[PDB]
Amino acid sequence: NSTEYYDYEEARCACPARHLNNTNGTVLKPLGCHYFCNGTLCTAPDGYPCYNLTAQQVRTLTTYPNTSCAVGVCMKGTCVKNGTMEQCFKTP
Amino acid sequence: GRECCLEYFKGAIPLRKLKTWYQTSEDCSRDAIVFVTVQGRAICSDPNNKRVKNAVKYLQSLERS
Numbered sequence A: 001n002s003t004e005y006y007d008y009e010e011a012r013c014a015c016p017a018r019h020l021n022n023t024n025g026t027v028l029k030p031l032g033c034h035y036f037c038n039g040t041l042c043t044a045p046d047g048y049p050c051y052n053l054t055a056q057q058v059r060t061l062t063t064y065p066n067t068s069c070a071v072g073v074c075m076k077g078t079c080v081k082n083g084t085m086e087q088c089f090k091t092p
Numbered sequence B: 001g002r003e004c005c006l007e008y009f010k011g012a013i014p015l016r017k018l019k020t021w022y023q024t025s026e027d028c029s030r031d032a033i034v035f036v037t038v039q040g041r042a043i044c045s046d047p048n049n050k051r052v053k054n055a056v057k058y059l060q061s062l063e064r065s
Helices: A007-012 A055-059 B050-058
Strands: A034-037 A040-043 A049-052 A068-075 A078-089 B018-023 B033-037 B042-045
Touching: A049 A078, B033 B050
Parallel strands: none
Antiparallel strands: A034 A040, A049 A068, A068 A078, B018 B033, B033 B042
């Protein structure tokens, strides 16, 4: 399609994003399914892992494994919880 | 590691502005090479792409220590 150019939108979203750590040796996961690259709002691809925390819960996050975080999978920019809970925390 | 790549930059690696590079944590779901420009832009790349593999092979001395 000569009239359509998606590469710029994708290139704008190819920056690393902060992920939270956990204690049971699973992959690092971001808070929800959106992230910012140089001010641009970006959405994680469908199937990407995520943590789903309410706003209250987000305030209780520390650098220690004292928060139980619901694991989810990204779908259309929503972190769909899958039932797994793990102790997640911020990495200094 | 604090950060992981969710997408790969498919374009041309910006060699003229390149300053350092690193490989994200093994606990990231997507294995990635991150190129960092002099102004600090960080660019996720596919470690299996031929141009990325060659760039990290000959630009070994640029790797984050």
